[model samples]
Structures are given as C-alpha cells and as structure tokens.
Target: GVIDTSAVESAITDGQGDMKAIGGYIVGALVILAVAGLIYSMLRKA
Candidate 1:
C-alpha cells in the first residue's frame, strides 16, 4: 500500500490541483494589499 499521496498527485488530477488554489489565494492577497497601500497613500496625503 502506498502511504504517500501518489495516486492523488496533481499530475493525475484535474481543476483545483495541489498548488492551484494556493497560487490563486496568494495573487488575490497581493492584489488586496496593493489596493490597501493605494488607499493608505491617498489618506496619508489628505
């Protein structure tokens, strides 16, 4: 019996692969942070 996640590996799966959602979350967080930074800059100058 394979104790490792060999059968459910991303290469053998579809859609939300192993690191797919993780990467999406990271990108979304970065975008949010960038927007927050912009808002802070606007407020800081006001």
Candidate 2:
C-alpha cells in the first residue's frame, strides 16, 4: 500500500488558511484597543 501525500498537503494548506483568518482578527482587536486607550487618555485630561 502507498501513502497519500496529496491528502497531507491539503490538510496543511487548510490549517494555514484558518490560522491566517485568526491572525487578522487578532490584529484588528489590538488596533481597536490601542485607539480606545488613546481616546481614554484624551478624555481623562479634560
């Protein structure tokens, strides 16, 4: 019997795709938090 390398390659590609989606969300959250902190600081000074 022979092993299927195509299946393994597809699985790895799918996993990388999922990770990229998650990475985008994580970056978006961080940016939102940074903007919020800046706004809070400005309001606190007033």
Candidate 3:
C-alpha cells in the first residue's frame, strides 16, 4: 500500500491549526515577561 501525502498533510495542518495559535500567544507572553524582569533587575541598582 502507498502512503498518501494529501491526507497526511491535511491532518497535520488541521491538527496544528488551533494549537499553533495558542502556542504563539503563550510564547509571546512569556518572552515579554522575561524581558521585562531582566530589564527591571538591570535598572534596580541605578
């Protein structure tokens, strides 16, 4: 039997569609928060 790329591609795209958005939001928020903390620490002794 041959492996169909179309169905596999479709499933991959569909499966990741929702999680991608959520993951993006999560990563963005964490990165911003971490940068903010680092900046705050750097300025603490000033």
Candidate 4:
C-alpha cells in the first residue's frame, strides 16, 4: 500500500480553491459584521 502523505495538502488546496470561489468581498463582509457584533456585545455588557 502506497501511503500518501500529501493528502492533507490536497485537501487544503481544494478548500482554498472553494474559498477563492467565494471571493474576498463575502469574507470581508463576514469579518466586519463579526467584529461589529463583538463590539456591540461588549458595549451591552458594560
């Protein structure tokens, strides 16, 4: 049996390809929204 050590690398590469398909704007918006929500929660707690 041939042990493939690059399986993880292939998985990561495939995942990155999917992420690229999602584009940057969608990811950026999600990050911005998450940060805004975190700040809002902190302010509410304070």
Candidate 5:
C-alpha cells in the first residue's frame, strides 16, 4: 500500500526519462502500416 502511493511519484520522474518508452511506439506504427498497406495497394488494384 505504501509503494502504491509512491509509485506515481516514481513513475513521473523515473518513467519520464525512460528512452524505452519512445521505442515502444515503433510497434504501434508497424501495426498501422500493415492495415494501411492492405488498403493503399489493394484499393488501387481494384
């Protein structure tokens, strides 16, 4: 229970500096690219 209250404070400053968070977005981008590729290319062929 003590750490739960302190966790936000830790996440704010500690998590804020994390470079890994930036890299995490790349996974989301690739997911969107898959869908985009299907329509962007498939629609043109139709």
Candidate 6:
C-alpha cells in the first residue's frame, strides 16, 4: 500500500500558485518583523 496525497498536494500547489500570481515579488515585505512583534504583543496581553 502507498500513501495518497493528491488532494493535499493539489491544494497546496494551487494555493502557492495563486499567491505567486498575485504577488511574486517582495513577498518578504509582508512579513515585517515589527508587525509580527506587535501582533505577538497584542496576543500576549489577551
């Protein structure tokens, strides 16, 4: 028997493809560390 992940693989590939199509450049800009720190700070207080 073999594992089957066609559905999962297709779903992930499709998601990445869509994201790349939407903004394939400067993607790191969306992950600014200060923004993440702010989110963490907010969550820590909650």
Among these predicted structures, which one has the highest lDDT? Answer: 2
Q: TM-scores for all candidates?
A: 0.55, 0.77, 0.59, 0.49, 0.41, 0.38
lDDT of 5 by residue, 1-46 (tens): 3446677787887666675677687678997999999999999998
Error of 3 at 6 (Å): 10
lDDT of 3 by residue, 1-46 (tens): 8877898888889789978999798899998999999999999968
Question: In terms of TM-score, how similar is model 4 to the real structure?
Answer: 0.49
| TM-score head-to-head 2 vs 3, winner | 2
User: lDDT of candidate 4 vs native?
Assistant: 0.89
**What's the residue-level lDDT of 29 in candidate 6?**
69
- Cα lDDT, all candidates: 0.81, 0.94, 0.90, 0.89, 0.79, 0.83
Cα error of candidate 1 at position 44, Å: 0.9
* Pairs that clash in candidate 1: none
Model 4 regions more than 4 Å off: 1-22
lDDT of 4 by residue, 1-46 (tens): 6878798989899999988878876788898999999999999998
The superposed Cα distance between candidate 2 and the true structure at residue 29, in angstroms, equals: 1.3
Error of 2 at 7 (Å): 0.6
Q: How well is each residue in 1-46 modelled by candidate 2, as lDDT tens digits?
A: 9887998899999999999999898899998999999999999999
Clashes of each: 0, 0, 0, 0, 0, 0
Model 6 lDDT per residue over 1-46, tens place: 9988888999999899988877855566666866998899999998
The all-Cα superposition gives candidate 6 an RMSD in Å to the true structure of 10.5
User: When superposed on Cα atoms, how far off is each prediction in RMSD?
Assistant: 5.1, 1.5, 3.2, 6.8, 6.0, 10.5
Clash pairs for candidate 2: none
The CA-based lDDT of model 2 is what? 0.94
Poorest lDDT segment (10 consecutive residues) of candidate 4: 18-27
Per residue, candidate 1 scores C-alpha lDDT tens digits across 1-46 of 5487776675567646756878787799998999999999999998
TM-score of model number 6: 0.38
Which 10-residue span in candidate 1 carries the lowest summed lDDT? 10-19
Off by over 4 Å in 2: none
Q: What ordering of candidates by TM-score runs from best to worst?
A: 2, 3, 1, 4, 5, 6
